[PDB]
Design a binder for this molecule. Sequence first.
Ligand code: HEM
Ligand code: HEM
Ligand code: HEM
Ligand code: HEM
Ligand SMILES: *[C@@H]1CC(=O)N(CCC(=O)NC)C1=O
Ligand SMILES: *[C@H]1CC(=O)N(CCC(=O)NC)C1=O
Lengths: 141, 141, 146, 146
Amino acid sequence: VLSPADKTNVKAAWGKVGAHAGEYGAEALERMFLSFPTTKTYFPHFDLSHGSAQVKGHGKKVADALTNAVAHVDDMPNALSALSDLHAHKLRVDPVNFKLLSHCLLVTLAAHLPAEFTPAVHASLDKFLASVSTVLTSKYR
Amino acid sequence: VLSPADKTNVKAAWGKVGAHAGEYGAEALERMFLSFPTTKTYFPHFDLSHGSAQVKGHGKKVADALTNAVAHVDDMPNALSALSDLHAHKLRVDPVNFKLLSHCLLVTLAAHLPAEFTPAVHASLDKFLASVSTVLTSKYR
Amino acid sequence: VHLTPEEKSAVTALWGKVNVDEVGGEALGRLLVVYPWTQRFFESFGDLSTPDAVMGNPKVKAHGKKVLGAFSDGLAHLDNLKGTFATLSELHCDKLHVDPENFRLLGNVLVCVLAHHFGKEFTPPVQAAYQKVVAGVANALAHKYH
Amino acid sequence: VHLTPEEKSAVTALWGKVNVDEVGGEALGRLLVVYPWTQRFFESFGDLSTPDAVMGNPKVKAHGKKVLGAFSDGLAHLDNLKGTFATLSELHCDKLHVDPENFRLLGNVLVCVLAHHFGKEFTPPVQAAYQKVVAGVANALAHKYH
Ligand code: HEM
Ligand code: HEM
Ligand code: HEM
Ligand code: HEM
Ligand SMILES: *[C@@H]1CC(=O)N(CCC(=O)NC)C1=O
Ligand SMILES: *[C@H]1CC(=O)N(CCC(=O)NC)C1=O
């Protein structure tokens, strides 16, 4: 339901992330696992050590889904529809954990994109990630 | 957008509430103000005394918006759209307070619907109130 | 947490009425139905396939008696909730990896169960006294998380 | 709160590099921009209608310095946050009626501001240490609400 303003800021920030999107996805996951260790139990078949190849590969899938969501910003429910079923029905991800990963994504963007991470862009990225989270939790309505 | 099961469960429950919806909205407000006193500061020059005619008036407004949303479950963003600009911009209602009111609405419905408030109907009413709360906070998303 | 004399009396009288063999299972069953991500932690309890299966599940009934027993212990120790949940806090944090937001949800489900079973007797003041109790329990169980 | 000694060391070292005149202002202004319901508590601070207006607002900057000073007090008293924040807990609860969920939000905004200020230096381990600190400050400010 993002305002016009919010879509402009999100595309600009994500544009500059560019080919680093996978790296930043992987760093956001690492920050989440270290800051909020309850979240590690969703990844029992993963090497969660610093610089894990498996976490790098999973970061790419998360980043790709966000890239796709930015490209489909006006129709996010449909662009992430299968992911809601996976996260809610199969994986039973606690809704709190989406707030945790979203926060860790904002921290990662602030650490790498000091020029781009203005207060306006921060507010827009938070609204973009909450909207992504609302879709991924939507089989919890 | 509630599931078919949730829409059917909410309509059944709301039908049993029937003409008592305003009564239950007042009781839910009363319950919120007593259980969660931080919420009283959003009604600074209201009479918040037990059985307040003013709280009855407001309980009617809340109950009527919920009854309208039950009749418009497949288009709630449109049916509540007015209230969302209000609660975000003018009132600056903390998103947590929607969770507090929603809980007090469930307690009120439980205390009045001995037969109807089954675990599945409770789950559907929770999804319904969460969906209402999401529309009413959408100017933050 | 500190209840007024009025509030302690109200809490104790209602809790006397509570069926210790059933109310905990009712609260845990409703948690699992209402907030279905919570089933992730209870899959070894067996059949959770429908709301009736969850509510009739023998492991859910059995474990609910222990959850309610932990609440009854807390009601007897409002003054010292941290000690009354000390190792239970460690169990939920270190072994089970439960997010402490769910302790607030279970407290709120228990309040809804008391409202459902006791009807008009679960007055706004009685509810306000129970909201202090279940917040106090949730904060005590969250102690080891911070 | 339970920082390991290494986490306390990591937190203290970074905090020494924090500009006391600016970071509290940045964190408060971003709270007001990102979570606009929070503007309800600062309705006398003047124009908060645009990001640029908030971030350049002198009362926001002045108040932010006092907020950062209180975090500095928390970092110098990590084994007694409850006592350190007892007065401020009563103030926020009795006179301001601020929901304690907003204490968690301001702590997370401060973490974003430290990341913005320190770049790669704000490593995942340093962030994990700071999450324990801001969770403990929020917990301590919430104490009198219980
Ligand atoms: C911005 C939020 C999120 C996005 C965009 C996202 C995206 C994805 C994607 C694209 C997949 C892979 C689907 C496939 O390849 O078929 C996935 C899998 C998964 N996600 Fe998420 N996710 C998010 C949040 C979360 C959170 C918060 C958790 C848990 C704390 C989580 C846990 C998982 C798990 C466990 C998998 C399966 C991993 C495996 O075994 O391969 N996700 N997610
Ligand atoms: C189910 C949730 C809610 C519903 C359905 C709802 C509905 C309404 C309605 C219909 C009105 C009146 C609109 C008009 O006057 O034309 C209103 C006003 C208001 N609402 Fe909400 N509301 C909800 C939640 C909340 C919450 C959680 C708060 C605060 C804790 C809140 C605070 C107010 C206030 C302060 C007013 C204005 C009363 C006055 O000063 O005249 N609302 N709401
Ligand atoms: C907030 C109040 C809660 C209380 C008082 C409580 C109490 C207990 C107690 C006493 C046990 C030990 C059972 C035994 O070994 O006999 C336990 C175990 C457990 N609790 Fe909780 N708990 C609470 C909340 C939660 C929540 C919200 C979850 C998950 C969403 C959870 C998940 C578990 C699990 C998975 C076990 C292990 C059960 C097993 O496999 O045997 N608890 N809890
Ligand atoms: C979590 C960390 C927080 C800390 C450490 C903190 C600290 C403080 C301090 C030190 C003061 C006194 C200022 C003075 O000496 O003049 C204060 C006042 C105040 N705080 Fe907080 N605060 C926090 C969170 C919040 C939040 C989240 C809100 C609102 C959303 C808030 C709203 C206020 C207000 C309105 C005042 C009175 C300001 C005035 O009008 O002068 N605080 N706080
Ligand atoms: C500080 C602010 C506030 O609400 N309270 C009451 C705490 C409480 O609910 N105790 C039962 C304060 O003392
Ligand atoms: C997180 C969960 C937990 O049990 N604790 C306390 C002690 C512990 O084992 N930490 C390593 C937490 O801090």
